[PDB]
Amino acid sequence: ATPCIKAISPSEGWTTGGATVIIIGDNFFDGLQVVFGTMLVWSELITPHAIRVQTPPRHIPGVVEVTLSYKSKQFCKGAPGRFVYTALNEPTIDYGFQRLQKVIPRHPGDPERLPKEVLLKRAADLVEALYGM
């Protein structure tokens, strides 16, 4: 009757945290906590087979073990969930945004530096016109 993790969805998120994640498994109950590496968060019980959490921030990117905890007892250490944190400022991601900043078309009224949301919006507009539909 111990809580067990069978799957986690999504399995990745940004280091800034705040993503909704569903943990699927067995023997869940109200009050169960979830630990991402060392970062503990509380959960919402959906059914005994699913709980919902918001990811905690993590200082560094990388793979973490996801385990469960209740009254400081750890569960799932022998079969932990896997969750991957990515940093928006990882050098290869950042270099991609720097490339886009130089060639994304600027529209009247734009700020001097286009925000990343806009770089991505217009890159997708352009790629959709090439390969979309």
The burial class, CB within 10 Å (0-12 / 13-18 / 19+), for 113 is exposed
Distance CA 92, CA 61 (A): 13
User: Nearest distance from residue 22's CB to a copy of itself, in Å?
Assistant: 5
User: Nearest distance from residue 98's CB to a copy of itself, in Å?
Assistant: 9
Asked if residue 49 binds Cl ion (CB under 5 A), the reply is no
Among residues 66, 54, 58, 56, the alpha carbon closest in space to that of 20 is found at 54
Taking CB under 5 A as the criterion, the residue among 2, 101, 110, 121 binding Cl ion is 101
Taking CB under 8 A as the criterion, the residue among 20, 27, 74, 89 binding a copy of itself is 20
Binding site for a copy of itself (CB under 8 A): 6-7, 9-10, 20, 22, 24-25, 46-47, 49-50, 52, 86, 88, 90-93, 95-97, 99-100, 102-105, 116-121, 123-124, 126-128, 130-132
